[PDB]
Amino acid sequence: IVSRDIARGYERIPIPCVNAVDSEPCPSNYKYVSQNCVTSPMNIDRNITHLQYCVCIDDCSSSNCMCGQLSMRCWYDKDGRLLPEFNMAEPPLIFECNHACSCWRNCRNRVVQNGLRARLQLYRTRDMGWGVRSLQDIPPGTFVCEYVGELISDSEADVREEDSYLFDLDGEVYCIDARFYGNVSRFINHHCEPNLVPVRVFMAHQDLRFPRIAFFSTRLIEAGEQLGFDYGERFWDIKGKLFSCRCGSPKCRHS
């Protein structure tokens, strides 16, 4: 227990850090943030009259809900989990209800905006590196965490040496750099057969240039299992030569 909570009380549940390998302290060469931040002007469209919203009089579980229509359909179930019909291989954009909607703060189309649910833990792996794992089981289709970091422009990313903490959002494109500013996600390692899938979501605003990145369980995750996701082509076409993937997956396409 080298740290009770790396979020310093910002998440709904603490995220302790333990080291059972070497004697290295908890990471501290970065600033933890639970929400995306910017280090410059960023003209995100927060015009409330530009938001598309719903006028549901129920708990938004009907076929009429405008917000679900935008998402093709609401994909959350009564518990807040993704429906089996959800395409993990090619996720759709999810538009959750927002403050312009007529519904209540507890309608069914609100999951990612409710914050952390699963008890996670940061820990030192054998590789002398760091990783994240669940201290409880996570049913499939559950929202685990968001990839939070510093929001930056395309070119801005091009002039950064350390680029291992970037996440492309995909006109002009933007990125999230978790190197200097980030949440528990910056510590999640790559894996070829990932139990976490990133989903572009929209909540308080609907500026398509800035989707927020939500990670969902692509299958059951057992207490103690290590979270992971597919970093992607761009990553490996750059780091593939500095080293080969040590994910240990029978289907590894990078080692």
Ligand X SMILES: COc1cc2c(NC3CCN(Cc4ccccc4)CC3)nc(NCCCN(C)C)nc2cc1OCCCCCN
Contact status: 246 vs ligand X (CB under 6 A): no
Could you say which of 32, 86, 202, 235 contacts ligand X (CB under 6 A)?
A: 235
Residues 118-137 that bind ligand X (CB under 6 A): none
Could you say which of 103, 112, 120, 151 contacts Zn ion (CB under 5 A)?
A: 103
Task: Report in angstroms how near the CB of residue 190 gets to ligand X at its nearest.
Answer: 7
CA pair distance 35, 178, nearest whole angstrom: 11
CA–CA distance from 116 to each of 49, 79, 144, 158, 214 (Å)?
Answer: 29, 14, 7, 32, 11
Residue 63 gets which letter from DSSP?
A: S
CA–CA distance from 160 to each of 154, 163, 165, 237 (Å)?
Answer: 11, 6, 11, 17
Annotation-wise, does 26 bind a ligand?
A: no
Q: Is the CB of 165 or the CB of 181 nearer to ligand X? A: 165
Name which of ligand X, Zn ion, none residue 143 binds, using a CB cut-off of 5 to 8 Å depending on partner kind. none
User: In 10 A of CB 18, how many CB atoms?
Assistant: 13
Could you say which of 5, 168, 193, 225 contacts ligand X (CB under 6 A)?
A: 168
Could you say which of 107, 118, 120, 213 contacts Zn ion (CB under 5 A)?
A: 107
User: In 10 A of CB 116, how many CB atoms?
Assistant: 20
Instruction: Give bridge partners of residue 214 from the DSSP assignment.
Output: 146, 199
CA pair distance 91, 86, nearest whole angstrom: 7
Contact status: 163 vs ligand X (CB under 6 A): yes
CA dihedral 77, 83, 86, 92 (to 10 degrees): 0
Contacts to Zn ion by CB under 5 A: 54, 56, 60, 65, 67, 97, 101, 103, 107, 109, 192, 245, 247, 249, 252, 254
Contacts to ligand X by CB under 6 A: 154, 157-161, 163-168, 175, 231-232, 234-235, 238-239
Binding-site residue positions: 54, 56, 60, 65, 67, 97, 101, 103, 107, 128-130, 165, 189-190, 192, 245-247, 252
